[PDB]
Amino acid sequence: LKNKKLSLWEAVSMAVGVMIGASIFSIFGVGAKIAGRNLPETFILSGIYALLVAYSYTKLGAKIVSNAGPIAFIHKAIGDNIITGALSILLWMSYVISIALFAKGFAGYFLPLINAPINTFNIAITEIGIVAFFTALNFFGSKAVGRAEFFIVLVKLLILGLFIFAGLITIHPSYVIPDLAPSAVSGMIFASAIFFLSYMGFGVITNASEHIENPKKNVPRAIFISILIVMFVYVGVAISAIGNLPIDELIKASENALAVAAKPFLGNLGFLLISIGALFSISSAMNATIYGGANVAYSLAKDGELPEFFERKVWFKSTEGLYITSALGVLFALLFNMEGVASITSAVFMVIYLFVILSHYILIDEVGGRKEIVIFSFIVVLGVFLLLLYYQWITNRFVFYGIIATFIGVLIFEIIYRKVTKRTFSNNMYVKS
Ligand SMILES: CCCCCCCCCC
Numbered sequence: 001l002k003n004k005k006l007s008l009w010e011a012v013s014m015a016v017g018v019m020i021g022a023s024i025f026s027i028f029g030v031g032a033k034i035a036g037r038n039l040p041e042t043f044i045l046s047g048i049y050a051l052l053v054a055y056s057y058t059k060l061g062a063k064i065v066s067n068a069g070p071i072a073f074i075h076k077a078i079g080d081n082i083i084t085g086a087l088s089i090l091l092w093m094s095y096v097i098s099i100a101l102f103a104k105g106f107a108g109y110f111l112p113l114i115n116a117p118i119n120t121f122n123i124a125i126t127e128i129g130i131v132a133f134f135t136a137l138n139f140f141g142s143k144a145v146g147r148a149e150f151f152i153v154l155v156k157l158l159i160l161g162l163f164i165f166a167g168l169i170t171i172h173p174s175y176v177i178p179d180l181a182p183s184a185v186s187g188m189i190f191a192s193a194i195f196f197l198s199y200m201g202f203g204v205i206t207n208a209s210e211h212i213e214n215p216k217k218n219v220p221r222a223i224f225i226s227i228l229i230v231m232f233v234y235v236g237v238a239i240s241a242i243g244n245l246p247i248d249e250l251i252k253a254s255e256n257a258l259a260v261a262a263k264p265f266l267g268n269l270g271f272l273l274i275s276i277g278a279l280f281s282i283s284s285a286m287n288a289t290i291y292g293g294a295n296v297a298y299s300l301a302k303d304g305e306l307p308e309f310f311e312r313k314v315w316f317k318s319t320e321g322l323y324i325t326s327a328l329g330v331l332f333a334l335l336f337n338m339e340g341v342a343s344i345t346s347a348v349f350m351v352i353y354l355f356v357i358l359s360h361y362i363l364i365d366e367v368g369g370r371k372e373i374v375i376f377s378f379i380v381v382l383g384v385f386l387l388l389l390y391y392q393w394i395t396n397r398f399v400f401y402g403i404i405a406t407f408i409g410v411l412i413f414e415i416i417y418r419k420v421t422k423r424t425f426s427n428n429m430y431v432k433s
């Protein structure tokens, strides 16, 4: 008896697909708004943060194998307690808010495509509709869409290959050169904090590590390769879009930026292709996030453990979790705007990453690595976290309290859940590895 395993390239594709769905087709507009022409440099900077985090994930994942992902690293370092417990809930939440992000991104490209007006109602309906669709998919087609994921990722990479290389032919180099004004530089740095989520490949990979062939080798390789691929794609797309459309026209077309940005150099067929590619990209990212991420993370948080053998591409256990995940996802999507959801997601990922970096530090004699680099990584991510919170405090204080309420709500829930259920975590998550 054995799990259906992913090869290296399938694992790479999975992370690349999720990352592109979020960065290219969901939050790209927000980046044009905050970073403007410095957006290409924002992606690079966010990629540096991602690589610093990757240093820890790759060292830990070469030694520890578990579908519990970061929660296995954390348990191995600090044992079982309310922190470990709350982090398992937080990892689930990170998938929940990502679902809101994808739903929003889908609505943004979908409504202009069908000529529907942008309303608070039309947006709301389309988000509810797309989430409900992926919820229902559990019962009829989540595995089949799963088999289509690899081919959707290839196609959107080609489409974005076209966008990059055709776009570069006609770019104005005069709007490609980085703006070094103090306010252009500081917008670039604030955006980088929001755009940390652009490299959210860690989740789907490590939550699938036992379903990955030769995981001690291929989990670290998939994390590193996928980050490098998307770094090149993002920079190519930001330059091409920015060099072809007035920066203030990117911002008005925020919800579907790249389809409007394709028009100058690919005409109405480019608008159509980018829009259709966006819908498939986001769709495939949502399937990977729900069936592969959220299903795993919910069961681990609820049970304190996972089955040794299960189908990743369905809601394999505790079906109530599927409805809870979808309902909370729709809630976040209705309450906040794209920049809001992006900020909350990025904040949550940073807290997970900090505890992984800490775990790497505690377990350094066992897993290896340089203590200097690990401390450096921790300080960077913490700094970026606080920059994000500061930015929210001055820009949108509702988002600020939203972020704080999430962390606090998660910790309080853990204490109450642990007391009600007696649920505990053990080294049986990773002991066999
Ligand atoms: C608004 C409901 C959308 C219906 C699902 C369509 C599948 C997405 C593929 C483009």
Ligand SMILES: CCCCCCCCCC
Pocket: 089, 298, 301, 302, 320
């Ligand atoms: C993430 C914590 C999940 C708690 C829900 C348990 C409900 C049990 C349904 C029978």
